[PDB]
Amino acid sequence: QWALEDFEIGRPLGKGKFGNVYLAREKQSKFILALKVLFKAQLEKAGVEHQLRREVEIQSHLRHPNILRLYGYFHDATRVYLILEYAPLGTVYRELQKLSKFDEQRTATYITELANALSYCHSKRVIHRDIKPENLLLGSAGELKIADFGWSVGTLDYLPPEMIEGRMHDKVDLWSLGVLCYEFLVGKPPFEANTYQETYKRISRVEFTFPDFVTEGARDLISRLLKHNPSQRPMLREVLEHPWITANSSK
Ligand SMILES: c1ccc2[nH]c(-c3cc[nH]n3)nc2c1
């Protein structure tokens, strides 16, 4: 449908191995969006093309306030272009370095927004797996928007024991939500190591601890989420229904 000459590219927004995302405006519509620029070269090279066209599938057909819209795509010679919704307030990653830590009411809200987001996804039998702050965008309202659906069906920090030990995986996303929740509160993930190999162990053995300032209800919720056994992990409903969530989730 589209072409590059339909757009006026703007300030660069992001980097990464495959290329960059830029601000851009659609010529005749004046519409503002984001253009992901991926090199055909590197997509083939790094044997991923299949992943790319799966991201295209899933993230297109999806619709939800807490999921980055994907309006479509197009390619040329050197590259493929993903026409993405644009998110004014950037990544959660950035707001985390900037603040280093989050409060309970910000954390809780994010957790909700995230829960609901994944509710909709699970309902459509799609799982993310790559839910890390580098992947969470903020809308104008300051609201969470899950981007990026490459790995939707490397940094182990976000990956649950089953995935990591290479097993039957169905609940993963709830482990991550646990992880995410801990990261928001403490300022780094609960499984952070210095090496790939150590992290693996730390995760495999579910070794994590709570700095003093982490309130009891938070621990509870996180603890419940970070169970080694997939089956023992709450359902999103319970997470939404948790007393520390509801107590705190401004939204
Ligand atoms: C900083 C500030 C705003 C941003 N929006 C985006 C973005 C990426 C895809 N859609 N919107 N990245 C940003 C980085």
Curated annotation (Swiss-Prot):
Activity regulation, per record: Activation of CDK1, appears to be an upstream event of AURKA activation. Phosphatase inhibitor-2 (PPP1R2) and TPX2 act also as activators. Inactivated by the G2 checkpoint. Inhibited by GADD45A and p53/TP53, and through dephosphorylation by protein phosphatase type 1 (PP1). MLN8054 is also a potent and selective inhibitor. Activated during the early phase of cilia disassembly in the presence of CIMAP3. Inhibited by the small molecule inhibitor VX-680.
Q: Outcome of residue 79 to A?
A: Reduces ubiquitination and proteasomal degradation
**Which UniProt keyword terms apply here?**
ATP-binding, Cell cycle, Cell division, Cell membrane, Cell projection, Cilium, Cilium biogenesis/degradation, Cytoplasm, Cytoskeleton, Isopeptide bond, Kinase, Membrane, Microtubule, Mitosis, Nucleotide-binding, Phosphoprotein, Proto-oncogene, Serine/threonine-protein kinase, Transferase, Ubl conjugation
Q: Which domain of life is it from?
A: Eukaryota
What job does the chain carry out?
Mitotic serine/threonine kinase that contributes to the regulation of cell cycle progression. Associates with the centrosome and the spindle microtubules during mitosis and plays a critical role in various mitotic events including the establishment of mitotic spindle, centrosome duplication, centrosome separation as well as maturation, chromosomal alignment, spindle assembly checkpoint, and cytokinesis. Required for normal spindle positioning during mitosis and for the localization of NUMA1 and DCTN1 to the cell cortex during metaphase. Required for initial activation of CDK1 at centrosomes.
Quote the record's miscellaneous comment. Answer: Centrosome amplification can occur when the cycles are uncoupled, and this amplification is associated with cancer and with an increase in the levels of chromosomal instability.
- What protein name does the entry list? Aurora kinase A
Species per Swiss-Prot/TrEMBL record: Homo sapiens
Question: From which lineage does this chain's organism come?
Answer: Eukaryota, Metazoa, Chordata, Craniata, Vertebrata
Q: Which gene encodes it?
A: AURKA
